[PDB]
Ligand binder design. Sequence first.
Ligand SMILES: *[C@@H]1O[C@H](CO)[C@@H](O[C@@H]2O[C@H](CO)[C@@H](O)[C@H](O)[C@H]2NC(C)=O)[C@H](O)[C@H]1NC(C)=O
Ligand SMILES: *[C@@H]1O[C@H](CO)[C@@H](O)[C@H](O)[C@H]1NC(C)=O
Ligand SMILES: *[C@@H]1O[C@H](CO)[C@@H](O)[C@H](O)[C@H]1NC(C)=O
Ligand SMILES: *[C@@H]1O[C@H](CO)[C@@H](O)[C@H](O)[C@H]1NC(C)=O
Ligand SMILES: *[C@@H]1O[C@H](CO)[C@@H](O)[C@H](O)[C@H]1NC(C)=O
Ligand SMILES: *[C@@H]1O[C@H](CO)[C@@H](O)[C@H](O)[C@H]1NC(C)=O
Lengths: 402, 204, 212
Amino acid sequence: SNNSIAIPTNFTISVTTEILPVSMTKTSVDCTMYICGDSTECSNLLLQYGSFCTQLNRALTGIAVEQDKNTQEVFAQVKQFGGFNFSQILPDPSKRSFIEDLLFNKVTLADAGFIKQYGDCLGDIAARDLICAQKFNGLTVLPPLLTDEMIAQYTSALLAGTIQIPFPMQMAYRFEGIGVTQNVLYENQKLIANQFNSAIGKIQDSLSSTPSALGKLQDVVNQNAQALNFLVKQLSSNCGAISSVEAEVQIQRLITCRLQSLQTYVTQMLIRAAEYRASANLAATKMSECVLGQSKRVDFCGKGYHLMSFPQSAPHGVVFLHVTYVPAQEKNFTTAPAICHDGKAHFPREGVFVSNGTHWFVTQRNFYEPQIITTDNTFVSGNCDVVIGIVNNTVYDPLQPE
Amino acid sequence: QVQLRESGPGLVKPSETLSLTCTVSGGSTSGYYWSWIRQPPGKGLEWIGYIYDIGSTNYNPSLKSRVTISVSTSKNQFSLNLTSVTAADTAVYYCARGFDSWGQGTLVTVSSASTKGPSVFPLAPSSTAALGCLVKDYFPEPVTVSWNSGALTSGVHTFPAVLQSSGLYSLSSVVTVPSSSLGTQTYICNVNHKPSNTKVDKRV
Amino acid sequence: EIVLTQSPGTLSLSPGERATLSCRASQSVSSIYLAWYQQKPGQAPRLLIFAASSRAIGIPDRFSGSGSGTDFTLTISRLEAEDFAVYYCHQYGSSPWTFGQGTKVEIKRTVAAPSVFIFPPSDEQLKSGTASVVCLLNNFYPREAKVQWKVDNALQSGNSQESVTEQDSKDSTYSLSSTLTLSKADYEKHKVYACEVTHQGLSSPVTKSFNR
Ligand SMILES: *[C@@H]1O[C@H](CO)[C@@H](O[C@@H]2O[C@H](CO)[C@@H](O)[C@H](O)[C@H]2NC(C)=O)[C@H](O)[C@H]1NC(C)=O
Ligand SMILES: *[C@@H]1O[C@H](CO)[C@@H](O)[C@H](O)[C@H]1NC(C)=O
Ligand SMILES: *[C@@H]1O[C@H](CO)[C@@H](O)[C@H](O)[C@H]1NC(C)=O
Ligand SMILES: *[C@@H]1O[C@H](CO)[C@@H](O)[C@H](O)[C@H]1NC(C)=O
Ligand SMILES: *[C@@H]1O[C@H](CO)[C@@H](O)[C@H](O)[C@H]1NC(C)=O
Ligand SMILES: *[C@@H]1O[C@H](CO)[C@@H](O)[C@H](O)[C@H]1NC(C)=O
């Protein structure tokens, strides 16, 4: 390249969906009910066989506090409009938005077995946990430390990036962080608002009817529900629970088979907990530097240069709406360092001289906003003969009186 | 309880592919994690990868570019395939369910040699006395030596195989018998070598 | 990768004592993402302790796990002779699951003298043309046993090859097989052959000699 510069001309602001699971449901096995459920001889059953229940329940308590730590690391980073729409993404007073309830209604149908049955038999009363574990073979689902109300409140707190600076000035400052001046936003605000609103309309159409983006959240919750239902299936159809109905060998083969099924459940839940921890670490990284700050990385928060992001609280997950800036229609323009006029060399004050073929303009380096060459845009230093790649043009003085 | 049994080729040439299958009897590949974990002889364990039934294929980020693990439509099998197998990939491959209930390993040698069958020779007593049988000149190492078709199990010592100067293995299996029943019982040794498909029963 | 290192690489403990094995990780892994395995010779690994201290089913109260962070301990109390194994520590927390080099646990008992046997070549390998003479040391402790061959009272080297078994589970004894392989032409040129052994449990070297 001798004298040529590649400059973008058009731009598209686009939103993208990033769904990351951050929490697994809590399971706890109540001892002295899993073993000797209805044998009514719970001394000799809990002596030889009852010491292996607490070993598994310790691991379930460990993965439960690990998932609570995951939700605390993701959703609790902080403690506490214009031409854009923002009506479907903000809370509308049960303190949830219109993307949040679509996510909740689509993801809560991924479970249809043990968890929904426990929620139905709970009766919205937390004092019946001794009763609800009696009829479901001793398996209990603990509620999380951070409830749905607190997660929704923390999401509403983290949605303070839409703030005492007004929102168009914030978008202008984020464009200035990208590398384009504020005149591009303030002169193309209607097109940007239309693209953002149409992108929210497309995200609502593509999140609800088709699965589309909900293929990495529905399947992991479905895997968790199937792993819990297979425990009840292999606890009821074969190796059944102790009911009212020499024979120590039979009760030994019933109490050893039901323990091994639980050990299978813990062993294949620990790997799922590791995968959820990796996803939660990715979510904490994507909320530390895409939310609560513009990111300098490329193609990490979203496709193109990252501009903004909004968090949303999905059940057992987090939904990031990434707002990004995609350049398009690159053009090759002819560059020149300085311009000679009246025997005086003029250098650009802030920008690059460009030529589109016939006329000469002063533009920014990262965008094609043509400005006519005046004396308020160039400064004078040196003579004509010293600059190597000089070009002939006329600088237009704004003072042209009668 | 579940049972995991591994099977596949015992010897592959270099720049070929492995195809190791794992039969699951007593359970189904429907909602559990399954992994392959290998072991070089006299070394530690190395992990290849684990899969789920519907998806979630995670492999090792040192061997990812030449590995694939796949479930089967029979609902009781899954297979491991490797690509561009060098001489450093010979191992006792293990098939496991997550990280619990492992299976017996299958040894996969990788060298450009030929499947040479065994040759059992007797080792008679020379007047408790010891009697045995010797196996010579066989290239792979799965070989199994049993005594009296699984009836004589006490006092059996099956020595590890040694590599000779000819590039072929040799082995010995010696059992001790009381002198009051030196010749009052029929003692035979049964060998079995699977790549050569050879079963020799030898008296003593 | 998180490299897991075990510092007591090989122990030698009498029955009734304690065994403390340490696994150290380069990065801080959590308390719930480590496991322990024992491996008998020629068998599959068996899970012993998953998470930090959660025992599996079918395992006695001897094996107890402890630790969190970058220092994990496995404790064997009232060790028996059926614990001759290689012990491994495993991480299932990070995506590249990493094992470690194992700790080989041996059992120590009193000195037992070897019983020495000689096996001549049979007629089958005489017909084939390669003679192989076997010297057998049946049950002996410790592993340090010296075996040598004498052909017409001349010491031989570079032809014998040894194989030593692992320890038996019921009693802590070894076994040794020395194979002397040579040609039929060299076997036809000598009359007396002998296997001579020396060991700590033998006051004098033991010679077992044979002819055709
Ligand atoms: C190079 O830039 C000049 C700037 O003057 C362009 O000329 C203008 O072209 C537009 C249409 O694109 C007309 O409406 C204007 O009237 C033109 N201005 C003048 C002063 O005549 C010119 O077209 C550009 N050339 C190319 C090849 O894009
Ligand atoms: C601009 O010119 C460069 C060489 O300087 C060339 O590689 C590139 O394709 C051109 N871009 C166009 C024609 O859009
Ligand atoms: C190009 O810019 C126009 C406005 O000048 C806009 O309407 C259009 O969407 C852009 N087209 C692209 C980026 O393809
Ligand atoms: C935002 O969009 C909704 C429908 O999506 C519409 O009802 C509302 O008037 C819009 N608000 C504006 C443009 O301020
Ligand atoms: C630029 O303009 C001057 C006017 O004095 C002229 O002499 C010179 O040749 C021009 N240079 C070019 C066209 O490269
Ligand atoms: C893996 O190997 C199996 C067994 O040979 C074969 O059926 C299958 O096509 C292979 N898969 C590949 C190469 O992806």
